[PDB]
Ligand binder design. Structure first.
Ligand SMILES: C[C@@H](c1cccs1)c1c(C#N)c2cnc(Nc3cnn(C4CCN(C)CC4)c3)nc2n1C
Ligand SMILES: [Cl-]
Ligand SMILES: [Cl-]
Ligand SMILES: [Cl-]
Ligand SMILES: [Cl-]
Ligand SMILES: [Cl-]
Ligand code: NA
Length: 264
């Protein structure tokens, strides 16, 4: 007899986690399609509940922007927490990347700069709302169709000067965050965005740990299977600089000369 059951029709599963799943659903009264995550409700008062609620609070402030997915509603049922957000019809950036890997045709420089600029505009909004994302990666960027890239998955979002941080994907994690130096949190999103663009440019699967992981955190870009301009490659390289203060801010990124050609 639930709200979820009565107001929506499920069309297809689009996501799966440890204690939840995501469906593409049509809402019965308005006719429109939504992505609805349904997750097991955490125990009352726990730090898990506070974590889950930061995500609801994050969407409810961060969704006004064109490069963050819109939020529509969140509610608790008996044992479940639901979040109804915008459905992006083009899927994740990760699935596009996987397809591109198989066929040997990747995002070209002009598409990579458009990716960098659009997600950079989304981070710029996030950062000006006094928040950081903390988990930028291709599986958390979604595609609507020109192409529009939108940040989703707000489950690591925290305030910009937070003393406590749940770190995101190991493949995209800056070293300073791993060492618990949270002085420059916005520059973790910049570091992760750089390696997101490297993935899109056709790189091999990034390391989770080991020597190559440390190689990258020296400021070395992984091998990219295509010719990029030197100034674009150097923008990416400084975005993974070991000093986070040397990496550009999201405002400096969107105003960058290299990205002036991509500005719509
Ligand atoms: C992170 C999660 C949520 C967090 C909170 C609530 S829901 C979320 C979105 C949001 N927000 C979100 C938005 N759009 C899409 N879109 C999509 C995915 N996969 N597909 C593909 C299906 C197979 N077909 C064949 C080709 C498209 C489309 N997927 C989304 N997912 C997973
Ligand atoms: Cl509803
Ligand atoms: Cl799935
Ligand atoms: Cl990914
Ligand atoms: Cl990867
Ligand atoms: Cl390099
Ligand atoms: Na969270």
């Amino acid at each position: 007899k639930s709200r979820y059951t009565t107001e929506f029709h499920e069309l297809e599963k689009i996501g799966s986690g440890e204690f939840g799943s995501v469906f593409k659903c049509v809402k019965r009264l308005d006719g429109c399609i939504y992505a609805i995550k349904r997750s097991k409700k955490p125990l009352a008062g726990s730090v898990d509940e506070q974590n889950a609620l930061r995500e609801v609070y994050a969407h409810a402030v961060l969704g006004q922007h064109s490069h963050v997915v819109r939020y529509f509603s969140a509610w608790a049922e008996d044992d479940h927490m639901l979040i109804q957000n915008e459905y992006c019809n083009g899927g994740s950036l990760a699935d596009a990347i996987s397809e591109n890997y198989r066929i040997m045709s990747y995002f070209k420089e002009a598409e990579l700069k458009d990716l960098l600029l659009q997600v950079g505009r989304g981070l710029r909004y996030i950062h000006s709302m006094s928040l950081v994302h903390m988990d930028i990666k291709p599986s958390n960027i979604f595609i609507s169709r020109k192409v529009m890239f939108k940040i989703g998955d707000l489950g690591h979002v925290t305030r910009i000067s937070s003393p406590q941080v749940e770190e995101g994907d190991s493949r995209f994690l800056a070293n300073e965050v791993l060492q618990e130096n949270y002085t420059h949190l916005p520059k973790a999103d910049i570091f992760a965005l750089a390696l997101t663009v490297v993935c899109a440019a056709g790189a091999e699967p990034l390391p989770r740990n080991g020597d190559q992981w440390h190689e990258i955190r020296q400021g070395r870009l992984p091998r990219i299977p295509q010719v990029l301009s030197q100034e674009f490659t150097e923008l990416l390289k400084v975005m993974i600089h070991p000093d986070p203060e040397r990496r550009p801010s999201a405002m400096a990124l969107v105003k960058h000369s290299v990205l002036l050609s991509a500005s719509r």
